[PDB]
Protein backbone atom coordinates (compact mmCIF):
# COMPACT_ATOMS: atom_id res chain seq x y z
CA UNK A 1 0.00 0.00 0.00
CA UNK A 2 2.69 2.52 0.99
CA UNK A 3 4.60 1.46 -2.12
CA UNK A 4 1.60 2.25 -4.29
CA UNK A 5 0.98 5.65 -2.59
CA UNK A 6 4.64 6.52 -3.25
CA UNK A 7 4.28 5.72 -6.93
CA UNK A 8 1.13 7.87 -7.16
CA UNK A 9 2.90 10.84 -5.55
CA UNK A 10 5.85 10.35 -7.88
CA UNK A 11 3.57 10.39 -10.90
CA UNK A 12 1.80 13.65 -9.87
CA UNK A 13 5.09 15.22 -8.94
CA UNK A 14 6.34 14.53 -12.49
CA UNK A 15 3.19 15.07 -14.53
CA UNK A 16 3.49 17.51 -17.48
CA UNK A 17 1.46 18.17 -20.62
CA UNK A 18 4.16 16.57 -22.71
CA UNK A 19 4.23 13.25 -20.78
CA UNK A 20 0.52 13.23 -19.92
CA UNK A 21 -0.47 10.25 -22.08
CA UNK A 22 2.43 8.17 -20.79
CA UNK A 23 1.85 9.11 -17.13
CA UNK A 24 -1.84 8.31 -17.48
CA UNK A 25 -0.98 4.81 -18.78
CA UNK A 26 1.43 4.35 -15.87
CA UNK A 27 -1.20 5.47 -13.39
CA UNK A 28 -3.72 3.00 -14.85
CA UNK A 29 -1.10 0.26 -14.58
CA UNK A 30 -0.60 1.25 -10.95
CA UNK A 31 -4.00 2.09 -9.52
CA UNK A 32 -6.47 -0.77 -9.27
CA UNK A 33 -10.19 0.04 -8.98
CA UNK A 34 -10.05 -0.36 -5.18
CA UNK A 35 -7.39 2.36 -4.94
CA UNK A 36 -9.25 5.04 -6.90
CA UNK A 37 -11.01 6.53 -3.86
CA UNK A 38 -7.64 7.14 -2.18
CA UNK A 39 -6.27 8.66 -5.39
CA UNK A 40 -9.27 10.99 -5.63
CA UNK A 41 -8.67 12.13 -2.06
CA UNK A 42 -4.96 12.60 -2.73
CA UNK A 43 -5.52 14.61 -5.91
CA UNK A 44 -8.04 16.98 -4.29
CA UNK A 45 -6.65 17.38 -0.77
CA UNK A 46 -2.91 17.36 -1.50
CA UNK A 47 -2.56 18.68 -5.08
CA UNK A 48 -5.54 20.72 -6.37
CA UNK A 49 -5.99 22.49 -3.04
CA UNK A 50 -2.50 24.01 -3.09
CA UNK A 51 -1.41 23.90 -6.77
CA UNK A 52 -3.74 26.27 -8.57
CA UNK A 53 -1.14 26.90 -11.27
CA UNK A 54 -1.59 23.23 -12.34
CA UNK A 55 -5.38 23.13 -12.25
CA UNK A 56 -5.48 23.02 -16.10
CA UNK A 57 -2.98 20.20 -16.07
CA UNK A 58 -4.91 18.19 -13.54
CA UNK A 59 -8.19 18.90 -15.35
CA UNK A 60 -6.58 17.72 -18.58
CA UNK A 61 -5.40 14.60 -16.70
CA UNK A 62 -9.04 13.76 -15.90
CA UNK A 63 -10.00 14.25 -19.57
CA UNK A 64 -7.18 11.94 -20.62
CA UNK A 65 -7.88 9.19 -18.05
CA UNK A 66 -11.53 9.11 -19.17
CA UNK A 67 -12.82 7.31 -16.05
CA UNK A 68 -16.27 8.66 -15.20
CA UNK A 69 -16.47 6.87 -11.83
CA UNK A 70 -13.17 8.49 -10.86
CA UNK A 71 -14.44 11.85 -12.04
CA UNK A 72 -17.49 11.45 -9.82
CA UNK A 73 -15.21 10.58 -6.87
CA UNK A 74 -13.10 13.66 -7.53
CA UNK A 75 -16.16 15.93 -7.67
CA UNK A 76 -17.56 14.46 -4.45
CA UNK A 77 -14.18 14.94 -2.75
CA UNK A 78 -14.01 18.54 -4.02
CA UNK A 79 -17.39 19.28 -2.45
CA UNK A 80 -16.41 17.49 0.78
CA UNK A 81 -13.19 19.50 1.24
CA UNK A 82 -15.01 22.76 0.37
CA UNK A 83 -17.54 21.92 3.09
CA UNK A 84 -14.81 21.26 5.63
CA UNK A 85 -13.56 24.77 5.02
CA UNK A 86 -17.04 26.38 4.81
CA UNK A 87 -17.98 25.06 8.27
CA UNK A 88 -14.66 25.96 9.91
CA UNK A 89 -14.12 28.76 12.44
CA UNK A 90 -13.42 31.90 10.39
CA UNK A 91 -10.63 34.43 10.97
CA UNK A 92 -9.27 37.10 8.63
CA UNK A 93 -5.72 36.15 9.65
CA UNK A 94 -6.21 32.55 8.42
CA UNK A 95 -4.86 33.28 4.96
CA UNK A 96 -4.05 29.64 4.45
CA UNK A 97 -7.58 28.29 4.85
CA UNK A 98 -8.98 31.16 2.77
CA UNK A 99 -6.54 30.30 -0.07
CA UNK A 100 -7.39 26.60 0.13
CA UNK A 101 -11.04 27.46 -0.24
CA UNK A 102 -10.41 29.81 -3.17
CA UNK A 103 -8.32 27.16 -4.92
CA UNK A 104 -10.98 24.48 -4.42
CA UNK A 105 -13.56 26.93 -5.81
CA UNK A 106 -11.41 27.58 -8.84
CA UNK A 107 -11.03 23.84 -9.39
CA UNK A 108 -14.75 23.22 -8.83
CA UNK A 109 -15.64 25.66 -11.60
CA UNK A 110 -13.13 24.06 -13.92
CA UNK A 111 -14.54 20.55 -13.56
CA UNK A 112 -18.23 21.57 -13.62
CA UNK A 113 -19.23 24.79 -15.33
CA UNK A 114 -16.20 24.89 -17.69
CA UNK A 115 -17.14 21.38 -18.87
CA UNK A 116 -20.79 22.43 -19.23
CA UNK A 117 -21.83 20.44 -16.19
CA UNK A 118 -24.00 21.96 -13.47
CA UNK A 119 -23.29 22.68 -9.86
CA UNK A 120 -26.36 21.01 -8.40
CA UNK A 121 -28.12 22.72 -5.51
CA UNK A 122 -28.12 19.37 -3.65
CA UNK A 123 -24.29 19.55 -3.57
CA UNK A 124 -23.84 23.25 -3.12
CA UNK A 125 -26.41 26.04 -3.15
CA UNK A 126 -24.28 28.99 -4.19
CA UNK A 127 -26.97 31.67 -3.97
CA UNK A 128 -27.96 30.51 -0.50
CA UNK A 129 -24.32 30.48 0.60
CA UNK A 130 -24.01 34.17 -0.22
CA UNK A 131 -27.19 35.03 1.64
CA UNK A 132 -26.09 33.01 4.67
CA UNK A 133 -22.68 34.68 4.68
CA UNK A 134 -24.43 38.05 4.68
CA UNK A 135 -26.50 37.05 7.69
CA UNK A 136 -23.56 35.72 9.64
CA UNK A 137 -21.26 38.70 9.02
CA UNK A 138 -18.08 40.06 7.51
CA UNK A 139 -15.83 37.14 8.53
CA UNK A 140 -18.01 34.67 6.58
CA UNK A 141 -18.29 37.07 3.62
CA UNK A 142 -14.49 37.35 3.53
CA UNK A 143 -14.27 33.59 2.83
CA UNK A 144 -17.38 33.11 0.77
CA UNK A 145 -17.33 36.02 -1.68
CA UNK A 146 -13.82 35.23 -3.06
CA UNK A 147 -14.75 31.53 -3.17
CA UNK A 148 -17.89 32.19 -5.23
CA UNK A 149 -15.91 34.45 -7.57
CA UNK A 150 -13.36 31.71 -8.21
CA UNK A 151 -16.15 29.28 -9.03
CA UNK A 152 -17.98 31.65 -11.33
CA UNK A 153 -14.82 32.58 -13.22
CA UNK A 154 -15.37 29.38 -15.20
CA UNK A 155 -18.85 30.34 -16.39
CA UNK A 156 -17.54 32.61 -19.14
CA UNK A 157 -15.76 29.60 -20.63
CA UNK A 158 -19.03 27.63 -20.85
CA UNK A 159 -21.44 27.84 -23.78
CA UNK A 160 -24.09 26.75 -21.30
CA UNK A 161 -23.33 28.80 -18.17
CA UNK A 162 -21.91 32.02 -19.59
CA UNK A 163 -24.03 35.13 -19.11
CA UNK A 164 -26.96 35.55 -19.51
CA UNK A 165 -27.51 31.98 -18.20
CA UNK A 166 -30.24 32.41 -15.57
CA UNK A 167 -28.46 30.35 -12.90
CA UNK A 168 -25.29 32.40 -13.34
CA UNK A 169 -27.14 35.70 -13.42
CA UNK A 170 -29.11 34.89 -10.24
CA UNK A 171 -25.82 34.62 -8.42
CA UNK A 172 -24.44 37.72 -10.08
CA UNK A 173 -27.50 39.70 -9.04
CA UNK A 174 -27.05 38.69 -5.39
CA UNK A 175 -23.40 39.77 -5.69
CA UNK A 176 -24.72 43.07 -7.11
CA UNK A 177 -26.89 43.47 -3.99
CA UNK A 178 -23.93 42.74 -1.76
CA UNK A 179 -21.85 45.26 -3.71
CA UNK A 180 -24.39 47.93 -2.71
CA UNK A 181 -24.00 47.32 1.01
CA UNK A 182 -22.60 50.18 3.04
CA UNK A 183 -20.37 48.01 5.19
CA UNK A 184 -19.24 45.42 2.69
CA UNK A 185 -15.44 45.70 2.72
CA UNK A 186 -13.95 47.60 -0.23
CA UNK A 187 -11.75 44.58 -0.95
CA UNK A 188 -14.88 42.50 -1.42
CA UNK A 189 -16.56 45.12 -3.58
CA UNK A 190 -13.42 44.93 -5.76
CA UNK A 191 -13.61 41.11 -5.84
CA UNK A 192 -17.12 41.45 -7.24
CA UNK A 193 -15.98 44.09 -9.77
CA UNK A 194 -13.11 41.85 -10.95
CA UNK A 195 -15.49 38.91 -11.36
CA UNK A 196 -17.78 41.14 -13.50
CA UNK A 197 -14.83 42.13 -15.70
CA UNK A 198 -13.72 38.47 -15.94
CA UNK A 199 -17.27 37.70 -17.16
CA UNK A 200 -17.31 40.64 -19.65
CA UNK A 201 -20.14 42.17 -17.60
CA UNK A 202 -20.68 45.77 -16.52
CA UNK A 203 -21.59 45.75 -12.86
CA UNK A 204 -23.95 48.61 -13.53
CA UNK A 205 -26.02 46.52 -15.96
CA UNK A 206 -26.78 43.93 -13.29
CA UNK A 207 -30.18 43.81 -11.57
CA UNK A 208 -29.82 43.74 -7.76
CA UNK A 209 -33.08 42.76 -6.07
CA UNK A 210 -34.21 42.93 -2.46
CA UNK A 211 -33.11 39.55 -1.15
CA UNK A 212 -30.89 41.15 1.54
CA UNK A 213 -33.93 42.99 2.97
CA UNK A 214 -35.98 39.77 3.20
CA UNK A 215 -35.36 38.97 6.85
CA UNK A 216 -37.70 35.96 6.98
CA UNK A 217 -35.95 34.38 4.02
CA UNK A 218 -32.56 35.03 5.59
CA UNK A 219 -33.61 33.58 8.93
CA UNK A 220 -34.69 30.31 7.36
CA UNK A 221 -31.85 29.28 5.03
CA UNK A 222 -30.66 25.66 4.76
CA UNK A 223 -27.32 26.20 6.50
CA UNK A 224 -24.04 25.56 4.72
CA UNK A 225 -21.64 27.45 6.99
CA UNK A 226 -22.53 25.04 9.85
Amino acid sequence: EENIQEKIAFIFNNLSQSNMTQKVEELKETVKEEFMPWVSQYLVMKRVSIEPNFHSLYSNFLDTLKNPEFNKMVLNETYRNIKVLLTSDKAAANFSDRSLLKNLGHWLGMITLAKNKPILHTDLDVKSLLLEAYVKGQQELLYVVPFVAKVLESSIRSVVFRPPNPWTMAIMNVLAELHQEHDLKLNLKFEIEVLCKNLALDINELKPGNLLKDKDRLKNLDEQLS
Binding site: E6, A9, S16, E51, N53
Partner: protein
Protein backbone atom coordinates in the same frame (compact mmCIF):
# COMPACT_ATOMS: atom_id res chain seq x y z
CA UNK B 1 14.74 32.94 4.95
CA UNK B 2 10.99 32.20 4.80
CA UNK B 3 11.70 28.54 3.95
CA UNK B 4 11.91 25.40 6.10
CA UNK B 5 15.37 23.82 5.90
CA UNK B 6 16.13 20.16 6.53
CA UNK B 7 19.01 17.83 6.00
CA UNK B 8 19.55 14.12 5.68
CA UNK B 9 22.83 12.32 6.11
CA UNK B 10 23.50 10.24 2.99
CA UNK B 11 26.44 8.76 1.17
CA UNK B 12 27.23 9.86 -2.35
CA UNK B 13 26.17 6.37 -3.60
CA UNK B 14 22.77 6.71 -1.96
CA UNK B 15 21.85 10.14 -3.23
CA UNK B 16 19.71 9.01 -6.19
CA UNK B 17 17.86 6.53 -3.95
CA UNK B 18 17.22 9.43 -1.53
CA UNK B 19 16.00 11.65 -4.37
CA UNK B 20 13.59 8.93 -5.55
CA UNK B 21 12.19 8.70 -2.02
CA UNK B 22 11.83 12.46 -1.67
CA UNK B 23 9.99 12.66 -5.01
CA UNK B 24 7.72 9.86 -3.80
CA UNK B 25 6.83 11.52 -0.47
CA UNK B 26 6.84 15.31 -0.92
CA UNK B 27 4.26 17.47 -2.68
CA UNK B 28 6.33 19.09 -5.40
CA UNK B 29 4.77 21.89 -7.39
CA UNK B 30 8.03 22.69 -9.13
CA UNK B 31 11.52 22.04 -7.81
CA UNK B 32 15.08 23.07 -8.45
CA UNK B 33 17.74 20.44 -7.80
CA UNK B 34 21.26 21.87 -7.38
CA UNK B 35 24.52 20.05 -8.08
CA UNK B 36 28.04 21.35 -7.66
CA UNK B 37 29.27 20.96 -11.27
CA UNK B 38 28.03 20.98 -14.86
CA UNK B 39 29.09 17.36 -15.35
CA UNK B 40 27.11 16.27 -12.30
CA UNK B 41 24.04 18.21 -13.39
CA UNK B 42 24.01 16.65 -16.82
CA UNK B 43 24.61 13.12 -15.59
CA UNK B 44 21.94 13.38 -12.90
CA UNK B 45 19.40 14.91 -15.31
CA UNK B 46 19.87 12.30 -18.01
CA UNK B 47 19.59 9.59 -15.39
CA UNK B 48 16.39 10.79 -13.64
CA UNK B 49 14.91 11.61 -17.05
CA UNK B 50 15.36 7.93 -18.03
CA UNK B 51 13.52 6.95 -14.82
CA UNK B 52 10.48 9.06 -15.64
CA UNK B 53 11.15 12.35 -13.92
CA UNK B 54 9.95 15.50 -15.70
CA UNK B 55 13.11 17.63 -15.87
CA UNK B 56 15.16 20.17 -17.79
CA UNK B 57 18.75 20.98 -16.98
CA UNK B 58 20.91 24.10 -17.09
CA UNK B 59 24.63 24.50 -16.48
CA UNK B 60 27.76 26.41 -17.50
CA UNK B 61 28.62 24.66 -20.72
CA UNK B 62 25.64 26.14 -22.50
CA UNK B 63 25.07 29.38 -24.33
CA UNK B 64 23.23 32.03 -22.30
CA UNK B 65 20.55 32.17 -24.98
CA UNK B 66 19.84 28.50 -24.47
CA UNK B 67 19.76 28.81 -20.68
CA UNK B 68 17.27 31.65 -21.10
CA UNK B 69 15.04 29.47 -23.30
CA UNK B 70 15.13 26.59 -20.81
CA UNK B 71 14.32 28.91 -17.84
CA UNK B 72 11.45 30.42 -19.84
CA UNK B 73 10.04 26.98 -20.65
CA UNK B 74 10.51 25.87 -17.03
CA UNK B 75 8.56 28.89 -15.75
CA UNK B 76 5.79 27.91 -18.20
CA UNK B 77 5.69 24.47 -16.59
CA UNK B 78 6.86 22.46 -19.59
CA UNK B 79 8.84 20.41 -17.05
CA UNK B 80 8.26 20.06 -13.31
CA UNK B 81 11.88 20.04 -12.13
CA UNK B 82 15.08 21.84 -13.03
CA UNK B 83 18.55 20.38 -12.39
CA UNK B 84 21.22 23.11 -12.42
CA UNK B 85 24.38 24.70 -11.07
CA UNK B 86 24.81 27.90 -9.03
CA UNK B 87 26.26 30.34 -11.34
CA UNK B 88 23.24 30.90 -13.52
CA UNK B 89 20.20 31.04 -11.21
CA UNK B 90 20.93 34.63 -10.17
CA UNK B 91 17.70 36.56 -9.90
CA UNK B 92 15.44 33.71 -11.04
CA UNK B 93 12.00 33.95 -9.48
CA UNK B 94 9.57 31.19 -10.39
CA UNK B 95 6.65 31.43 -8.00
CA UNK B 96 5.71 27.78 -8.36
CA UNK B 97 9.03 26.47 -7.05
CA UNK B 98 8.19 25.23 -3.56
CA UNK B 99 11.09 22.82 -3.11
CA UNK B 100 14.83 23.22 -3.47
CA UNK B 101 17.01 20.08 -3.21
CA UNK B 102 20.70 20.56 -2.58
CA UNK B 103 21.65 17.26 -4.13
CA UNK B 104 25.23 18.43 -3.58
CA UNK B 105 25.64 20.57 -0.48
CA UNK B 106 27.33 23.87 -1.30
CA UNK B 107 30.56 25.08 0.25
CA UNK B 108 29.57 28.66 1.04
CA UNK B 109 26.90 30.46 3.06
CA UNK B 110 26.38 32.94 0.20
CA UNK B 111 25.70 30.14 -2.27
CA UNK B 112 23.50 28.29 0.20
CA UNK B 113 21.29 31.37 0.74
CA UNK B 114 21.04 32.08 -2.93
CA UNK B 115 19.98 28.52 -3.63
CA UNK B 116 17.34 28.06 -0.92
CA UNK B 117 15.95 31.51 -1.70
CA UNK B 118 14.68 29.96 -4.93
CA UNK B 119 11.83 28.23 -2.96
CA UNK B 120 10.90 31.27 -0.90
CA UNK B 121 8.11 33.42 -2.31
CA UNK B 122 6.18 35.99 -0.39
CA UNK B 123 2.95 34.39 0.76
CA UNK B 124 4.21 30.86 -0.03
CA UNK B 125 5.98 28.37 2.20
CA UNK B 126 9.05 26.69 0.72
CA UNK B 127 11.21 23.75 1.67
CA UNK B 128 14.93 23.21 1.17
CA UNK B 129 16.29 19.68 1.55
CA UNK B 130 20.04 19.16 1.90
CA UNK B 131 21.76 15.86 1.15
CA UNK B 132 24.77 15.82 3.49
CA UNK B 133 27.70 13.41 3.25
CA UNK B 134 30.33 12.97 5.93
CA UNK B 135 32.59 15.22 3.85
CA UNK B 136 30.03 18.05 4.04
CA UNK B 137 30.10 18.29 7.84
CA UNK B 138 32.58 21.17 8.15
CA UNK B 139 30.79 23.30 5.57
CA UNK B 140 27.41 22.54 7.19
CA UNK B 141 28.76 23.87 10.51
CA UNK B 142 30.33 26.91 8.96
CA UNK B 143 27.12 27.78 7.17
CA UNK B 144 24.95 27.21 10.26
CA UNK B 145 27.34 29.42 12.28
CA UNK B 146 27.33 32.27 9.76
CA UNK B 147 23.55 32.33 9.37
CA UNK B 148 22.86 31.77 13.05
CA UNK B 149 20.45 28.98 12.09
CA UNK B 150 20.11 25.27 12.75
CA UNK B 151 19.25 23.05 9.82
CA UNK B 152 16.96 20.40 11.26
CA UNK B 153 16.90 16.71 10.36
CA UNK B 154 14.21 15.57 7.92
CA UNK B 155 11.01 14.64 9.78
CA UNK B 156 10.34 10.91 10.22
CA UNK B 157 7.45 10.99 7.76
CA UNK B 158 9.93 12.50 5.28
Amino acid sequence: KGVTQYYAYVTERQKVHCLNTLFSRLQINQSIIFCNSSQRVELLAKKISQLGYSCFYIHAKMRQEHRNRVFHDFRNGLCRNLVCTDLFTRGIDIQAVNVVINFDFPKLAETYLHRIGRSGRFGHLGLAINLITYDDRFNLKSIEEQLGTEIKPIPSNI
